Structure 1
Amino acid sequence: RIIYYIQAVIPGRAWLIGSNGSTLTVREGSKIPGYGMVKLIDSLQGRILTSSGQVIKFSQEDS
């Protein structure tokens, strides 16, 4: 599948980058392909909770 990584996060929004180079921006209730619905955007600590249980974080080599 496609893995998404956090590029920048403020309260409210989050800018994401995928393994294909595609760039997205998401809000509190939003759709991510392959992940589902955004459940919680937590601006501190760089964590995004998703309805499928997966957690989107910063990249390990870019943090």
Structure 2
Amino acid sequence: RIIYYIQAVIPGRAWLIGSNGSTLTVREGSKIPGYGMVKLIDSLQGRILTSSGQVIKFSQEDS
């Protein structure tokens, strides 16, 4: 399916890139396709919590 990776994160926003190359930016309450509703943006440690229980991170060899 599609996998999203953190490109940049500040307090408040997060810029994500997908495996198709599309880029998005999100805030605390926002819609993400295929993942659900954003519950918490943690600027430290690079973790994004999602309503489906998933955590959005950096690519492992690109981080």
> TM bucket by the smaller chain?
over 0.9
Shift of 1:55: 0.5
Percent identity, aligned pairs only, is 100
Q: Separation in 1 of the partners of 2:59 and 2:38?
A: 19
**4+ long deviations beyond 3 Å:** none
1:4-63 Cα shifts (integer Å, max 9, x gaps): 000000000000000000000000000000000000000000000000001000110111
Query: Which stretches in structure 2 are left out of the alignment for 5+ residues?
Result: none
SS at match of 2:6: strand
TM-score with structure 2 length normalisation? 0.98
How many pairs were matched up? 63
* Equivalent residue number for residue 23 of structure 1: 23
The aligned counterpart of 1:41 is 41
